[PDB]
From Swiss-Prot, chain A:
Biotechnology section: Has been used to construct a 2,4,6-trinitrotoluene (TNT) biosensor strain.
Protein name in UniProt: DNA topoisomerase 1
Zinc finger feature spans (C4-type): 1-20
Function: Releases the supercoiling and torsional tension of DNA, which is introduced during the DNA replication and transcription, by transiently cleaving and rejoining one strand of the DNA duplex. Introduces a single-strand break via transesterification at a target site in duplex DNA. The scissile phosphodiester is attacked by the catalytic tyrosine of the enzyme, resulting in the formation of a DNA-(5'-phosphotyrosyl)-enzyme intermediate and the expulsion of a 3'-OH DNA strand. The free DNA strand then undergoes passage around the unbroken strand, thus removing DNA supercoils.
Subunit text: Monomer.
Family: Belongs to the type IA topoisomerase family.
Full protein segment contained here: 717 to 865 of 865
Organism: Escherichia coli (strain K12)
Induction of its expression: Transcription is increased specifically in response to 2,4,6-trinitrotoluene (TNT) and its indicator compounds 1,3-DNB, 2,4-DNT, and 2,6-DNT.
From Swiss-Prot, chain B:
Post-translational modification: Acetylated on several lysine residues in the presence of glucose.
Family: Belongs to the RNA polymerase beta' chain family.
Function, as annotated: DNA-dependent RNA polymerase (RNAP) catalyzes the transcription of DNA into RNA using the four ribonucleoside triphosphates as substrates. Resistance to the antibiotics salinamide A, salinamide B, rifampicin, streptolydigin, CBR703, myxopyronin, and lipiarmycin can result from mutations in this protein.
Signal peptide: none
Disulfide bond positions: none
Uses described in the biotechnology field: Co-administration of salinamide and rifampicin or salinamide and myxopyronin suppresses the emergence of resistance to both antibiotics.
Recorded superkingdom: Bacteria
Organism of provenance: Escherichia coli (strain K12)
Protein name according to UniProt: DNA-directed RNA polymerase subunit beta'
Residues included from the entire protein: 760 to 809 of 1407
Complex and partners: The RNAP catalytic core consists of 2 alpha, 1 beta, 1 beta' and 1 omega subunit. When a sigma factor is associated with the core the holoenzyme is formed, which can initiate transcription. The rRNA transcription and antitermination complex (rrnTAC) consists of RNAP, NusA, NusB, NusE (rpsJ), NusG, SubB, ribosomal protein S4, DNA and precursor rRNA; S4 is more flexible than other subunits.
Swiss-Prot record, chain C:
Enzyme kind, highest EC tier: transferase
PROSITE patterns: RNA_POL_BETA
A GO CC annotation given for this chain: transcription elongation factor complex
PANTHER family found in the cross-reference section: DNA-DIRECTED RNA POLYMERASE I SUBUNIT 2
Xref: NCBIfam families: PRK00405.1, rpoB
Disulfide bonds: none
Record field: catalytic activity: RNA(n) + a ribonucleoside 5'-triphosphate = RNA(n+1) + diphosphate
Protein's UniProt name: DNA-directed RNA polymerase subunit beta
N6-acetyllysine PTM sites in chain numbering: 1021, 1199
Oligomeric and partner information: The RNAP catalytic core consists of 2 alpha, 1 beta, 1 beta' and 1 omega subunit. When a sigma factor is associated with the core the holoenzyme is formed, which can initiate transcription. The rRNA transcription and antitermination complex (rrnTAC) consists of RNAP, NusA, NusB, NusE (rpsJ), NusG, SubB, ribosomal protein S4, DNA and precursor rRNA; S4 is more flexible than other subunits. In pull-down experiments interacts with CedA.
Gene (UniProt): rpoB
Record PTM: Acetylated on several lysine residues in the presence of glucose.
Curated annotation (Swiss-Prot), chain E:
Applications (biotechnology): Co-administration of salinamide and rifampicin or salinamide and myxopyronin suppresses the emergence of resistance to both antibiotics.
Assembly and binders: The RNAP catalytic core consists of 2 alpha, 1 beta, 1 beta' and 1 omega subunit. When a sigma factor is associated with the core the holoenzyme is formed, which can initiate transcription. The rRNA transcription and antitermination complex (rrnTAC) consists of RNAP, NusA, NusB, NusE (rpsJ), NusG, SubB, ribosomal protein S4, DNA and precursor rRNA; S4 is more flexible than other subunits.
Positions spanned in the full protein: 52 to 102 of 1407
Binding site for Zn(2+) 1: 19, 21, 34, 37
Organism lineage: Bacteria, Pseudomonadati, Pseudomonadota, Gammaproteobacteria, Enterobacterales
The protein, known as: DNA-directed RNA polymerase subunit beta'
Protein family per UniProt: Belongs to the RNA polymerase beta' chain family.
Role summary: DNA-dependent RNA polymerase (RNAP) catalyzes the transcription of DNA into RNA using the four ribonucleoside triphosphates as substrates. Resistance to the antibiotics salinamide A, salinamide B, rifampicin, streptolydigin, CBR703, myxopyronin, and lipiarmycin can result from mutations in this protein.
Lineage: superkingdom: Bacteria
Listed transmembrane segments: none
Modification note: Acetylated on several lysine residues in the presence of glucose.
Length: 149, 50, 1341, 253, 51
DNA sequence: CTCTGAATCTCTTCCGACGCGCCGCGGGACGTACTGACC
RNA sequence: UCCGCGGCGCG
DNA sequence: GGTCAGTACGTCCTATCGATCTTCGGAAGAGATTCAGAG
């Protein structure tokens, strides 16, 4: 069981088990934050605007890549599906499904992992010339279903 | 007992330093006290004109 | 016997007291502290090892996993000190810590391990200390000042009755832990004892006693003594201790064993007590009225009924006495209270106590600590246990425990770091004792109660804070991690430790930008002691008592060198011989006096230790086997000096200069000048600017060598030998055979610092003071630094001074300077400025460094190269472009008609605005260095590539030259070894050096030495290769510039600044002045020989200022010059070495009972000639601080030089040739240039920028701001009738926008008329008042 | 705007942001028919936020920014030594002002002071521009500025013309009494140090051990005449405190 | 921002006599309140006065 | 023996000289998705 | 360009 | 309907009060409590 507590940072949720110190947080328009996963560093992905390396993070916004010196570099970008497939092993048990998503659209363009806030779920969408190609694949019941947006 | 043409001992110089530093610190505080008094006097008397 | 280096120029000493203890290394207080911080400690008592053992091992919450610490290691820094200074990074070493993660089996026992892993976790960077006690934090060089803070322990103090009417002395006790909450006890005017924690709401003291599980009966038993009563038939008896009757009025008859003797109304006299004791009166009979009114000690319960007849602390009364008698209480116990010796304070406090149980007391303290919330038994118990009784949150340090036990007279000096119940009880008992009249309050300013906390301690504290944060994170991750699929590196985040350490070294109040005017500034900054800082005092709240000189400062803290202003007394200077005890207390050395003989044995005593003994003054005379010549010797003992017999003396001072600091010690004739002027002179020595050419002080104190050497400004030879190569930048020494290690090249290379910028924009330059082939010993000065001359501190210049008024140009401390001083560049100084041009990314385009600056003539562009950066060596003046930079103007859209108009006007139709770096107005200098820093990913310009290629060539050349020198040394070793055995000298010369290395040898250990040196040669080659590759990659690599910065171009300007009127000059005796006129040479006063004076000083300053030491120096300096003159002429006449030797020997022997004893008969003729050439300008003289030259000795030295004894000569006015009517004191004084230069002070403004909100002129010269016309100036104008001037200063010249525009236009038009309006600051005030909900308006507008 | 794309913000902006956040949250809770406890807590927080905005620190602990220093409220803007009244209204920074280290002019008459030529040029720039355009040497103001920047000889002649009988005010801090500001006719001197008449030093309490003095230029005719008639050193030979002479011989004199 | 603490249509234009959207940018449009963004064309000094 | 007023005690708030110079450090900003209005 | 803090110095 | 601009929400990141810097002196005013006099 996990209960609500208040402290210097407002209101949070902490688990009653003395052996477990897991803590979630209250957000603006929800009962409680989703179960944010542990950050996973990737030394093989280099930053472009700086010399840092990218680290995968999770949150209500979604799953993203951020510089390891985040207060200084402050460089973030969304991961590609091929990038995830390159480092599939390091991904925690939950996120592995993202690696199974199709990596390229029928037009052969490269895909990117996005977060649909209206449905609170991760999908993969393809972009060409920086604009969305209008093709997206979602995860519905253990399979990936793809179609025009 | 000694003057300044003669040399003060180490002990005599150490004794004199008490008065020296006391005077310096007293000036440091006295400036602030006098300034506050002067500002109060100016504020009370600034209206008066012949 | 004097060394070869010392024989160059021997300063004649005038001291008479033999030196027993050499002056300690002046920077030990910093180096020792940091060494304790970083160096390994197998016992785990100091530094990083102690912190690691304090935090580790780390375990999970009831888990089967543990993280433990094995060892730590400081790695090699990535950059050296110079590289860090150039690149603007911290000189730090990485901290590698070996850690072991152990996971046990789930089955019992808990100790059954099942897997162990070990790895070297990296946990941040530790800023290392340089060889001279400094830190490089962001390229900037910083000093961590030591802190004089209240020692942990317990202190008893009084308010001296100031807080209450009639001056009732209220007593308080305070427990100061090293880390934790404070605990104070204090007496109220009603004699009630109260307690407070962290100076929070006052509470009754007994509450704490009740919180420690002590009942009221137990409290009374602890604090009071009991009196026993018995009731038998109709008789009441008391058990009496006769001493208890002392001071009590005999209000009733006293009978015992059928004997009665009492005088009613009288006090019980001592004779009465003695009679009672001898009669063995153990019991007395007393009336009911006497026992009525006493306080019940323990609760009494009627056994028949179980009803509490009388509780503890209740006052006895006749009815209560009858009740207890009828109940059957044969024996009664009360508590004894005497109004003089045994007060009722605890009982009265219990009466005022609003609690009645342990839980009630815990609830009360919980509500006091955490107000506004309901209490809880578990929460209250946890809070009380954590406040003082948990090692995690309370730490009364080892020094704290020592002081705590000493104050309570406990035998043990070691113990637990948390408070026990007995500790609190004993503190309360001691406070009650002080209230009663036994014991005295502590002296807070006593140096035995203050403690020195240095760099290592503070760094350890911050590291411990970071490490406890890391420990909390580690516990969390260990409890909530995948135990087997990770490594120790995955559990430790280095961010908190690095953050804490970096914050301490950058933002702390004690981490200070090092003052670097001269070497004395560096030494005095590193020896500084501050009462401020974290855990210390504050300027506005520290009283006079803290600032004042205390008797315990003798030999520990200088009484003179404290600064003026708000910091007076709060910033002190460590004395010359003072060091720090193990516990952090200042110690001073003394010579042990054993059976009337002073011994060379030296004991370092602290203030508490010093108070016990009788210590003789350093000037007390003793001869042959040490014995006080005088039967009576002056001593100070317990802060009260007087005369004592020889036998009573326990210790003697080690030196006559052990009371002063370094700066005060450098002042000659300090005992002849007032402490105020001595303070001013010591402070002003630190502001002296190095000059173009260093000049030794003719009149010194003998401390110049120590200051110059201990400060790392000089290149000091670390091994003796013969100098093999010299130039302006490099000294190469061939080490002696008996001084080099086996398998070594035997060559030392010293690289000199040439024209680098100081923290104060002054010049740091090292110059060789040795020549080819000259012998060098260990410790010899090889190169002089700023303000150093042959290894002696040279802050200023020796100047010919006449003390006379001269036509008002010396009117008020003003100084008249000859033009010969300016022509000889004696006070000319070099200033280096760093100017930076920063290219930044901006909206609508990045800024570009280019020479194509719009709307700028080709003449201004000619000084630049093709990349837009000024050439090295270019002479530049104010307004010239150093680095050309442009910035996009924005869109600035123009209509086609507007575009045509701009095209017709000229080149104004451009989208680019000038943002180039220009020389500040008034600055004229030369470009001596250009450094280009480029963010990685930005293409390097042509100038950047050229600089990179030059740096690569320089690196290759330097490494190759060092390798060649080391190889030459190694092959010299080869030749020496082969000569020592198996010599083939002719064949060896025929053979090349590689064949020499390939040659064999006889079967001796020399073959082993050859093998070792060949291996060292291979190591030299490999080291050269790896260093070349590393330096190449470091030069090529990009720079970690600030975000948004594309490239930074830094230009260094060297300006030689000549002495001009307005510049501030001072001597060493508090004699400040500002130059008023540079007088032509023919106008200066001159003597019979025609020599003009260089500086004319006003005689009037000396009498009022009482700095007579400057007069004596002026005399002695004259003598110092006179001897030199007699040498100089003797050198010009090319006289024989014999006459020169005789005269110089006479000069050295002139003193009376001097301890120097120079003997020129042991010097070679060439050495004597070298000495005489060095003595040609003057004979340097050492006059120690309180053992200096007497007046008669100065007269004798003047007589040797054929100079007048009075020190006054007949001067003639150069303007008229007429003799001045009286003889004038003309001599030589050492004068300084005090960095308060007029060209840094002059500023003028007509119109410039204005503040955004106040719409008033900016402030400061750097901002080109206007002067502040404050309220006192407004009062001055109001005292006059200056209404229009005041209006124009308030309205037009400051804040009225339309007014100032119209005034400018009218002045241009020739109309000096004002059109004043409303100041904008008043509109701001109206809006701010309206923003507060107050309707403020102007009426009848 | 700052270097690096950051924006320097006033503390008032933070206070207003807190107030607006609390107000909007309270309005949203009121719309959604929130329970009494939640709306009461939100109202209390809004009251605390408004109190902090008006006068921070008067009740409870003052709300602090990221620097752990209390935020500056409107009362702090009005109150104190650094407030508007004492820092901006009763005293001001002024144009046409300068400062420099003072030295002795023993050749000076009582009514004149030595003024550095560079300081005079900078201070009298607008007068020089006007006299340049009067004589036709500079057609426009830009030409006048270029001429003065180049420091031509005719500019020096113009500067000598403009300072002939134009008094300047010399002030030494602290201005304890009205003699702390006095008017002098400036004589242009080479060098960067102001030359002060020896007899006025006692009134200024000025010595020459490093003192700096401030120079102000009266602009208007009334200001010049007040300097000449009321504030000039020749009118200040008696002390207003006691009537005894204040311009009294000392030291070498 | 549209209704923030520095709003142009509440307190005034950022630059003199220029609308926020740039539709009107000269003194000839003085006093005109833009239909697109509601910012009056006037001097920036009003941002110093308007509460 | 009790009640009221005056006096005394406790707690909280306000004030503390002016002018000038130098150095160091810090200070919310950026990204992505969804909704509305206009064409 | 603004504000704040810390440290140091001069009058 | 489709596209662009504007607006909304999330991330950095928390979770014990524990970080945190922490502790003057003097004078005046307001409120609370106690003593003396009168009933
Ligand atoms: Mg002075
Ligand atoms: Zn618009």
């Amino acid at each position: 069981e996990m209960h609500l507590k208040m402290g210097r940072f407002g209101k949070y949720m902490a688990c009653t088990n003395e052996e477990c110190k897991n803590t979630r947080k209250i957000l603006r328009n929800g009962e409680v934050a989703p179960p944010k996963e542990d950050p996973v560093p990737l030394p093989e992905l280099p930053c472009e605007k700086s010399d840092a390396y990218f680290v995968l993070r999770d949150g209500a916004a979604g799953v993203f890549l951020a510089a390891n010196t985040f207060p200084k570099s402050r460089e973030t970008r969304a991961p590609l599906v091929e990038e995830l497939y390159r480092f599939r092993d390091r991904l925690p048990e939950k996120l592995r499904y993202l690696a199974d998503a199709p990596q390229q659209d029928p037009e052969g363009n490269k895909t990117m992992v996005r977060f649909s806030r209206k449905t609170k779920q991760q999908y993969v969408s393809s972009e060409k010339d920086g604009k969305a190609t209008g093709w997206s694949a979602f995860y519905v019941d253990g399979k990936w279903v793809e179609g025009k947006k | 007992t000694a003057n300044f043409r003669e040399g003060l001992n180490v002990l005599q110089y150490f004794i004199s330093t008490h008065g020296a530093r006391k005077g310096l610190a007293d000036t440091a505080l006295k400036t602030a006290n006098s300034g506050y008094l002067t500002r109060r006097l100016v504020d009370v008397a600034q209206d008066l004109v012949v | 016997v004097y060394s070869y280096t010392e024989k160059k120029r021997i300063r004649k000493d005038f001291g008479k007291r033999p030196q027993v203890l050499d002056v300690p290394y002046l920077l030990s207080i910093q180096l020792d502290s940091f060494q304790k911080f970083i160096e390994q400690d197998p016992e785990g008592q100091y530094g990083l090892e102690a912190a690691f053992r304090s935090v580790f091992p780390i375990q999970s919450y009831s888990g089967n996993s543990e993280l433990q610490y094995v060892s730590y290691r400081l790695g090699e820094p990535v950059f050296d000190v110079q590289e860090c200074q150039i690149r603007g990074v911290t000189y730090s070493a990485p901290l590698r810590v070996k850690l072991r993660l152990v996971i046990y089996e789930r089955e019992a026992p808990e100790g059954t391990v099942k897997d162990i892993k070990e790895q070297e976790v990296y946990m941040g960077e530790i800023p290392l200390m340089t060889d001279n006690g400094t830190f490089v934090i962001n390229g900037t060089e910083r000093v961590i000042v030591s802190q004089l803070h209240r020692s942990p322990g317990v202190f008893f103090d009084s308010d001296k009755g100031k807080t209450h009417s009639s001056g009732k002395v209220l007593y308080n006790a305070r427990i100061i832990p090293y880390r934790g909450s404070w605990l104070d006890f204090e007496f109220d005017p009603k004699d009630n004892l109260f307690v407070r924690i962290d100076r929070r709401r006052k509470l009754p003291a007994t509450i704490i006693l009740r919180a420690l599980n002590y009942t009221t009966e137990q409290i009374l038993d602890l604090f009071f003594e009991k009196v026993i009563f018995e009731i038998r038939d109709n008789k009441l008896q008391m058990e009496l201790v006769p001493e208890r009757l002392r001071g009590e009025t005999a209000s009733f008859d006293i009978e015992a064993n059928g004997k009665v003797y009492v005088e009613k109304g009288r006090r019980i006299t001592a004779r009465h007590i003695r009679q009672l004791e001898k009669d063995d009166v153990k019991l007395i009979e007393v009336p009911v009225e006497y026992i009525a009114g006493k306080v019940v000690a323990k609760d009494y319960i009627d056994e028949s009924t179980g009803e509490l007849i009388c509780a503890a602390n209740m006052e006895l009364s006749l009815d209560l006495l009858a009740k207890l008698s009828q109940s059957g209480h044969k024996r009664i116990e009360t508590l004894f209270t005497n109004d003089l010796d045994h007060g009722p304070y605890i009982s009265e406090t219990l009466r005022v106590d609003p609690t009645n149980d342990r839980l009630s007391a815990l609830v009360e303290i919980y509500r006091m600590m955490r107000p506004g919330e309901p209490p809880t038994r578990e929460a209250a118990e946890s809070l009380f246990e954590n406040l003082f009784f948990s090692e995690d949150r309370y730490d009364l340090s080892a020094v704290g425990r020592m002081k705590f036990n000493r104050s309570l007279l406990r035998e043990e000096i070691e113990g637990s770091g948390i408070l026990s119940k007995d500790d609190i009880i004993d503190v309360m008992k001691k406070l009650i004792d002080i209230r009663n009249g036994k014991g005295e309050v502590d002296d807070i300013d006593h140096l035995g109660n203050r403690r020195i906390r240095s760099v290592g301690e503070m760094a350890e504290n911050q590291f411990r804070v970071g490490l406890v944060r890391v420990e909390r994170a580690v516990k969390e991750r260990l409890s909530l991690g995948d135990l087997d699929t990770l490594m120790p590196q995955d559990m430790i985040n280095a961010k908190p430790i690095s953050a804490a350490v970096k914050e301490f070294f950058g933002s702390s109040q004690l981490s200070q930008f090092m003052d670097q005017n001269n070497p004395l500034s560096e030494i005095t900054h590193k020896r500084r002691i501050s009462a401020l800082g974290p855990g210390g005092l504050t300027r506005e709240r520290a009283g006079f008592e803290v600032r004042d000189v205390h008797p315990t400062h003798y030999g520990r803290v200088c009484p003179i060198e404290t600064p003026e202003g708000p910091n007076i007394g709060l910033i002190n200077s460590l004395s010359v011989y003072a060091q720090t005890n193990e516990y952090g207390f200042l110690e001073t050395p003394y010579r042990k006096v054993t059976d009337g003989v002073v011994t060379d044995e030296i004991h370092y005593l602290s203030a508490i230790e010093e108070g016990n003994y009788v210590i003789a003054q350093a000037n007390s005379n003793l001869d042959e086997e040490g014995h006080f010549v005088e039967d009576l010797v002056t001593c100070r003992s317990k802060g009260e000096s007087s005369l004592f017999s020889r036998d009573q003396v326990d210790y003697m001072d080690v030196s006559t200069q052990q009371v002063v600091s370094v700066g005060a010690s450098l002042i000659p004739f300090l005992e002849h000048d007032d402490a105020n002027r001595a303070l001013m002179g010591a402070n002003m020595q630190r502001q002296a600017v190095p000059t173009l050419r260093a000049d030794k002080p003719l009149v010194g104190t003998g401390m110049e060598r120590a200051v110059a050497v201990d400060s790392g400004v000089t290149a000091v030879a670390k091994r003796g030998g013969v100098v093999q190569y010299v130039d302006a930048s490099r000294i190469v020494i061939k080490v002696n055979e008996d001084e080099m290690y086996p398998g070594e090249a035997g060559i030392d290379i010293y690289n000199l610092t040439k024209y680098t910028r100081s923290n104060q924009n002054t010049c740091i330059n090292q110059m060789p003071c040795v020549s080819l082939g000259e012998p060098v010993e260990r410790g010899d000065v090889l190169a002089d630094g700023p303000s150093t001359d042959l290894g002696e501190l040279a802050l200023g210049q020796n100047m010919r001074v006449a003390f006379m008024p001269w036509n008002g140009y010396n009117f008020e401390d003003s100084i008249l300077v000859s033009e010969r001083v300016v022509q000889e560049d004696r006070f000319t100084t070099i200033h280096i400025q760093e100017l930076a041009c920063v290219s930044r990314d901006t909206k609508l385009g990045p800024e570009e460094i280019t020479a194509d600056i719009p709307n700028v003539g080709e003449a201004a562009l000619s000084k630049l190269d093709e990349s837009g950066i000024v050439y090295i060596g270019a002479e530049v003046t104010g307004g010239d472009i150093l680095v050309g930079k442009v910035t996009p103007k924005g869109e600035t859209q123009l209509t086609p008609e507007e575009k045509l108009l701009r095209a017709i006007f000229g080149e104004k139709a451009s989208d680019v605005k000038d943002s180039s770096l220009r020389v500040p107005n008034g600055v004229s200098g030369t470009v001596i260095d250009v450094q280009v820093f480029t963010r990685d990913g930005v293409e390097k310009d042509k100038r950047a590539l050229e600089i990179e290629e030059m740096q690569l060539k320089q690196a290759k050349k330097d490494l190759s030259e060092e390798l060649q020198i080391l190889e030459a040394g190694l092959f010299s070793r080869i030749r020496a070894v082969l000569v020592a055995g198996g010599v083939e000298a002719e064949k060896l010369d025929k053979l090349p050096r590689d064949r020499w290395l390939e040659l064999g040898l006889t079967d001796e250990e020399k073959q082993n030495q050859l093998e070792q040196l060949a291996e060292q040669y291979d190591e030299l080659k490999h080291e050269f290769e790896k260093k070349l590759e590393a330096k190449r990659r470091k030069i090529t690599q990009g720079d970690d510039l600030a975000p948004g910065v594309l490239k930074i171009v830094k230009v260094y300007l060297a300006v030689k600044r000549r002495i001009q009127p307005g510049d501030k000059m001072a001597g060493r005796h508090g004699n400040k002045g500002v130059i008023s006129k540079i007088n032509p040479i023919e106008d200066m006063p001159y003597d019979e020989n025609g020599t003009p004076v260089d500086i004319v000083l006003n005689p009037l300053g000396v009498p009022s200022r009482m700095n007579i030491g400057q007069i004596l120096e002026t005399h002695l300096g004259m003598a110092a010059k006179g001897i030199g003159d007699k040498i100089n002429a003797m050198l010009k006449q090319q006289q024989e070495v014999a006459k020169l030797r005789e005269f110089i020997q006479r000069a050295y022997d002139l003193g009376a009972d001097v301890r120097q004893k120079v003997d020129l008969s042991t010097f070679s003729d060439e050495e004597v000639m070298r000495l005489a050439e060095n003595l040609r300008k003057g004979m340097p003289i050492a006059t120690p601080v309180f053992d200096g030259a007497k007046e008669a000795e100065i007269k004798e030295l003047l007589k040797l030089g054929d100079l007048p004894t009075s020190g006054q000569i007949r001067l003639y006015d150069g303007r008229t040739g007429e003799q001045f009517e009286r003889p004038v004191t003309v001599g030589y004084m050492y004068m300084l240039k005090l960095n308060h230069l007029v060209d840094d002070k002059m500023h003028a403004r007509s119109t410039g920028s204005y503040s955004l909100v106040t719409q008033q002129p900016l402030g400061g010269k750097a901002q080109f701001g206007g002067q502040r016309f404050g309220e006192m100036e407004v009062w001055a104008l109001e005292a006059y009738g200056a209404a229009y001037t005041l209006q124009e200063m308030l309205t037009v010249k400051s804040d009225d926008v339309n007014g100032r525009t119209k005034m400018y236009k009218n002045i241009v038009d020739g109309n000096h008329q004002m059109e004043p309006g409303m100041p904008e600051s008043f509109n701001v005030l109206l809006k701010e008042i309206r923003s507060l909900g107050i309707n403020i308006e102007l009426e009848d507008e | 705007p700052l270097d690096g794309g950051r924006f320097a913000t006033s503390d008032l902006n933070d206070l207003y942001r807190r107030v607006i956040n609390r107000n909007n949250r309270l309005k949203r809770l009121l719309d959604l028919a929130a329970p009494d406890i939640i709306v009461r807590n939100e109202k209390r927080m809004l009251q605390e936020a408004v109190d902090a905005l008006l006068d921070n620190g008067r009740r409870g602990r003052a709300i602090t920014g990221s620097n752990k220093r209390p935020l500056k409220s409107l009362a702090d803007m009005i109150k104190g030594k650094q407030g508007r009244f004492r820092q901006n209204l009763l005293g001001k920074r002024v144009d046409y002002s300068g400062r420099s280290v003072i030295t002795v002019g023993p050749y000076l008459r009582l009514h004149q002071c030595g003024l550095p030529k560079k300081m005079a040029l900078e201070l009298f720039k607008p007068f020089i521009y006007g006299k340049l355009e009067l004589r036709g040497l500079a057609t426009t103001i830009k030409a006048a500025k270029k001429m003065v920047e180049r420091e031509e000889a005719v500019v020096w002649d113009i500067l000598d013309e403009v300072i002939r009988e134009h008094p300047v005010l010399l002030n030494r801090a602290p201005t304890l009494h009205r003699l702390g500001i006095q008017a002098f006719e400036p004589v242009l001197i080479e060098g960067k140090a102001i030359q002060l008449h020896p007899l006025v030093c006692a009134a200024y309490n000025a010595d020459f051990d490093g003192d700096q003095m401030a120079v102000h230029v009266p602009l208007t005719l009334e200001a010049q005449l007040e300097a000449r008639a009321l504030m000039m050193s020749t009118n200040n030979i008696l002390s207003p405190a006691n009537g005894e002479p204040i311009i009294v011989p000392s030291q070498d004199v | 921002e549209r209704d923030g603490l520095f709003c142009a249509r509440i307190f005034g234009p950022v630059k003199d006599y220029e609308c926020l959207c740039g539709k009107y940018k000269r003194l000839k449009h003085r006093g005109v309140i833009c239909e697109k963004c509601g910012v009056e064309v006037t001097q920036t000094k009003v941002r110093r006065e308007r509460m």
